[PDB]
């Protein structure tokens, strides 16, 4: 139910690409690759989810971040599969610290939104038309996820945190609990609750993003069926 799933194809990751502070969380260096202790991870998801659950059942929102290529789509789903916000594309700058001002991009998105098959396109030259269509396009592209939240989250969940170092800063400056799934690659030091394991194989990525939202819904009421994973496992 826990490690039995994970022992399939979901444990250990990087090799001498690492960081020494990830020390307690490791079992062996077989194959010259660093293999992480799951027995320790067990005890971690426990204490991690204790906080996650707590935050869920009190109706406190969570922002999901995953820009890396072998994990983007896996985010778009779980997040919308829990009506919560995400960032699939570029982790923009000042999303949290200058929220005030990034927020005023949504107060342009919805301004364009109220115009997609509407009486004002009658007016305005063909110049603005396709232009604004092409604006909304990317406007939408980046702020699909980021939008559902219109006031600073109580926490953030993330995949490769070294890969989104920018994000971890913004949050941590605002005292916003940081929680994430990280590995040898990255350092535990600066994550308030950590899911230590493989941040690259969609396998290990998905499994962790699955039982993540599941516990969001169960603490909220009424767990459903699982969502897409085996897109093409080869």
């Amino acid at each position: 139910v826990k490690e039995l799933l994970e022992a399939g194809v979901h444990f250990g990751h990087e090799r001498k690409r690492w960081n020494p502070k990830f020390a307690r969380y490791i079992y062996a260096e077989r194959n010259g690759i660093h293999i992480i202790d799951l027995q320790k991870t067990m005890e971690e998801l426990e204490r991690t989810f204790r906080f996650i659950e707590d935050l869920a059942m009190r109706g406190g929102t969570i922002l999901f971040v995953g820009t890396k290529k072998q994990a983007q789509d896996i985010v778009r789903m779980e997040a919308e599969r829990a009506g919560m916000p995400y960032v699939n594309q570029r982790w923009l700058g000042g999303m949290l610290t200058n929220f005030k001002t990034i927020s005023q991009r949504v107060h342009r998105l919805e301004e364009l939104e109220a115009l997609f098959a509407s009486p004002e396109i009658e007016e305005r030259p063909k110049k603005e038309q396709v232009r604004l269509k092409h604006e909304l396009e990317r406007l939408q592209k980046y702020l699909s996820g980021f939008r559902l939240l219109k006031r600073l989250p109580d926490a953030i969940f993330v995949v490769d945190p070294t890969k989104e170092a920018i994000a971890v800063r913004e949050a941590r400056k605002l005292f916003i609990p940081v929680i994430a799934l990280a590995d040898t690659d990255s350092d535990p030091d600066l994550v308030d609750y950590i899911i230590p394991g493989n941040d690259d194989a969609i396998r290990s990525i998905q499994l962790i993003l699955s039982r993540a939202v599941d516990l969001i819904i169960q603490a909220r009421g009424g767990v459903v069926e699982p969502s897409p994973s085996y897109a093409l496992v080869q």
Partner: protein, 138 residues
Amino acid sequence: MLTDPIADMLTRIRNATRVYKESTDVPASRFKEEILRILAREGFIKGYERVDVDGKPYLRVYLKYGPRRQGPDPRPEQVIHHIRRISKPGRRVYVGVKEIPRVRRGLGIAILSTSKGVLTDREARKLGVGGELICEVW
């Protein structure tokens, strides 16, 4: 060859604390144990224990640290902010009871060898005795 054991001991502590080292060893000496005995009692360490590395006696020192904090840099504050050798081997220092210091206004401590074993600012002061000021701890 190490010119002063003590000053290195303290340093190794100062050095181990800086990285948040769970424990840290230090070669043994009865006078050191006496020191460390006060360090634990005064609440600067969990404690210590005699140990062995290749036949050679050490003292594993179990360090105590603060609680984890929020904001950027969560690194827990320290139990031992600052630890510094006083009577060094070149410049020895001695004091009668009346001449003893009040470390940090009393929050910290001054340790010292006297004819009656290793004591502290308050103890010695109270005993009514003096000796070689060893070091200051806070």
